[PDB]
């Protein structure tokens, strides 16, 4: 049939021989995915676009007849798409084209883990042509779904931010302003998304943890991606985590703002940001540095100012370490 | 009705912003309780998400370690195809580029 051998009887001796020698269209091809990674050619990114569009349509219409058993190969095929994009590192032009087509129709949890990783790999468009088409629906479901979908979007858009900032770093390498306005507006719209998601869930610490995880990648724009895009907190998150009630979110904010100090200082070296951004960061400083308290009170109850520090610091407060040293 | 609704929208946002600015933070009637009822509720909810966020940030570095291995392997296979393609560019330079038509007929 298919290399079903009959030398198994000889494979007593032939297994001894093995021991004797011991002693005496392209997604499911990782070795070929490197080719398409390297050719941004026209008839191959189109030979491949048309397959992805007609596989994400036919096999997604397959949902409308099973939705339960077809929901495991589609998940495992979208996983291969996701992996191929994480390797090849540019969003497949059918991945967005399927997303704009299937985001309005989308529910909260139908392949959420796969759909909200597809959003990460969306060819930076303008954030004026992609916002109404997609982000007006990643707010239509963001504000109507639970925290467990909410955290899965600011994480999804967190990875989207990196996958846009990579492609902007080499846009500095391969020789802006109107591209600048796109990531800045994405971050503000998330910063708009993430002040009203803060309000829907009564300042849930889980959701704001993911919010800061997004902002953990907004402090380091200049240092990491060579992009001069230091965008500070909107206060609806800054003080909402400043006056929060746990330190794994408090030290998170502290790490973000310390990287903000570092990034603003680095931007002052090379050079609106200066006037209003420095004003807002000194606002977030004087208000907070005077404020640096409830979760710290939890530690103090569990607990000579320098010794209190040492009790802190020693017990995992590393964002506080990076601030206090600064 | 689009315009007739935009006008009432601006009229309603005006009222809501004039009423929010009227809203001074009303902490005077805050709570007669000693707030232990609200406190040990808020720390207990903190206990409800802290286990629920450690369980997520443990999967975070799980997937970050798995992806560090995966993208290290991708970078290795990328530098390999980078040095290989560079040496192919250098070799195909002035090796097959020095191809004459009459020499191609002589090889035939």
């Amino acid at each position: 049939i298919y290399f079903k051998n009959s030398e198994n009887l000889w494979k007593t001796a032939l297994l001894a021989v093995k021991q004797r020698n011991r002693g005496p269209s392209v997604l499911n091809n990782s070795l070929l995915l490197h080719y398409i990674n390297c050719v941004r050619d026209e008839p191959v990114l189109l030979r491949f676009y048309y397959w992805l569009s007609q596989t994400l349509q036919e096999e997604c219409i397959w949902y409308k007849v099973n939705n339960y058993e077809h929901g495991k190969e589609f998940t495992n095929f979208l996983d291969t798409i996701i992996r191929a994009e994480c390797f090849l590192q540019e969003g497949f032009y059918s991945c967005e084209a399927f997303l704009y087509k299937s985001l309005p129709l989308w529910d909260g949890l139908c392949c959420r883990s796969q759909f909200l990783q597809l959003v990460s790999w969306i060819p930076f468009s303008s954030f004026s042509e992609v916002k109404p088409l997609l982000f007006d629906h990643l707010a239509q479901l963001f504000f109507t779904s639970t925290i467990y979908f909410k955290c899965s979007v600011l994480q999804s858009l967190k990875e989207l931010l990196q996958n846009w900032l990579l492609w902007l770093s080499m846009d500095i390498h391969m020789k802006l302003g109107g591209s600048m306005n796109s990531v800045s507006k994405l971050i503000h719209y998330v910063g708009w998304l993430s002040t009203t998601a803060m309000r829907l869930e009564s300042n849930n610490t889980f959701l704001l943890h993911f919010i800061l995880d997004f902002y953990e990648k907004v402090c380091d724009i200049y240092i990491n991606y060579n992009l001069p895009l230091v965008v500070l907190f909107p206060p609806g998150i800054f003080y909402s985590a400043l006056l929060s009630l746990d330190t794994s979110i408090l030290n998170q904010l502290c790490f973000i703002m310390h990287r903000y100090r570092k990034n603003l200082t680095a931007a002052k070296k090379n050079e609106n940001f200066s006037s209003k951004t420095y004003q807002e960061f000194n606002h977030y400083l004087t208000s907070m540095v005077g404020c640096l308290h409830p979760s710290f009170l939890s530690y103090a109850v569990s607990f000579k100012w320098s010794w209190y520090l040492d009790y802190l610091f020693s017990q995992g407060l590393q964002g506080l370490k990076l601030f206090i040293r600064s | 009705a689009q315009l007739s609704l935009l006008i009432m929208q601006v009229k309603c946002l005006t009222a809501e912003l004039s009423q929010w600015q009227k809203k001074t933070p009303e902490t005077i009637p805050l709570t007669e309780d000693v707030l232990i009822t609200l406190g040990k509720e808020e720390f207990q909810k903190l206990r409800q998400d802290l286990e629920m966020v450690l369980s997520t940030k443990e999967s975070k570095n799980e997937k970050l370690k798995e992806d560090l291995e995966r993208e290290q392997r991708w970078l290795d296979e990328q530098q390999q195809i980078m040095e290989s393609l560079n040496v192919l560019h250098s070799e195909l330079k002035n090796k097959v580029e020095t191809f004459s038509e009459s020499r191609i007929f002589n090889e035939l």
């Binding site: 959420r112 883990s113 639970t146 467990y148 979908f149 899965s152 994480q155 999804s156 | 997520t56 999967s59």
Partner: peptide, 12 residues
């Protein structure tokens, strides 16, 4: 990932 995980705290 934390998306595949966030789909199993929605259930659990």
């Amino acid at each position: 990932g934390v998306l595949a995980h966030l789909e199993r705290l929605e259930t659990q």
